[PDB]
Amino acid sequence: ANEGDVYKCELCGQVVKVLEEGGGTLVCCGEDMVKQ
Amino acid sequence: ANEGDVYKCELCGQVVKVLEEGGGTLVCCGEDMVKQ
Ligand SMILES: [Hg+2]
Ligand SMILES: [Hg+2]
């Protein structure tokens, strides 16, 4: 995921912003977070 | 996790900031992200 991108977890509504780019896929509540 | 908290994944170094608080645990590269 890229720096600055925002991801949301549709199961609990937690939203996070990427500060440092990395190669792994963001997961929350066992499900892939959705890129906003 | 709380709003404003910063999480890092030790396996790929991706860092994210919590914009909206949620009850799920943040995961990346299959592992729990570490609270900074
Ligand atoms: Hg990761
Ligand atoms: Hg979640």
Swiss-Prot record, chains A, B:
GO terms for molecular function: iron ion binding. The gene is dsr. Keywords: Electron transport, Iron, Metal-binding, Transport. The keyword Nucleus does not apply. This is Desulforedoxin. Fe cation binds at C9, C12, C28, C29. Its cofactor is Fe cation. The lineage of its organism: Bacteria, Pseudomonadati, Thermodesulfobacteriota, Desulfovibrionia, Desulfovibrionales. InterPro entries: Desulfoferrodoxin_N (IPR004462), Desulfoferrodoxin_N_sf (IPR038094), Desulforedoxin (IPR012002). The keyword Metal-binding applies. Binds 2 irons ions per subunit via 4 cysteine residues per iron. Homodimer. Nonheme iron protein possibly involved in electron transport. To the N-terminal section of desulfoferrodoxin.
